[PDB]
């Protein structure tokens, strides 16, 4: 049911509900995008 051993986080904020797209929409986006280089979009290389 997990992949880590951390007892609790170290930072949190209310900036987690601005979300412009729904879980069903995000799932259909994920199918087409197929996570190409997704964890590198901020690095532009």
């Amino acid at each position: 049911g997990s992949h880590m051993s951390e007892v609790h986080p170290s930072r949190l904020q209310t900036t987690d509900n601005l979300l412009p797209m729904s879980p069903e929409e995000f799932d259909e986006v994920s199918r087409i995008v197929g996570s190409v280089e997704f964890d590198s979009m901020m690095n532009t290389v």
Binding site: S22, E28, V36, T44
Partner: protein, 92 residues
């Protein structure tokens, strides 16, 4: 229209984010535009992103990828559309 209902629903948010990337109204008459401005303003100053675990950045990034896969312009108003197509166009 099984997956089509979801596919066509995503376009609403793409048009709303593209509008918000150009719009200047602090309280625009569009309900999504008011939210899209808060969303881009968050990402414009965030320190978490997809590499740290940010749920907001990753939400724009999906939405922008869906558009950028098709997009080919160098003057597009969405800031991440450019960043994403520049990486995606290198693939074969």
């Amino acid at each position: 229209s099984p997956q089509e209902s979801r596919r066509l629903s995503i376009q609403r948010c793409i048009q709303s984010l593209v509008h918000a990337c150009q719009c200047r109204n602090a309280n625009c008459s569009l309900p999504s535009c008011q939210k899209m401005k808060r969303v881009v303003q968050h990402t414009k100053g965030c320190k978490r992103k997809t590499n740290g675990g940010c749920p907001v950045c990753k939400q724009l990034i999906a939405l922008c990828c869906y558009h950028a896969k098709h997009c080919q312009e160098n003057k597009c108003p969405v800031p991440f559309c450019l960043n994403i197509k520049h990486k995606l166009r290198q693939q074969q």
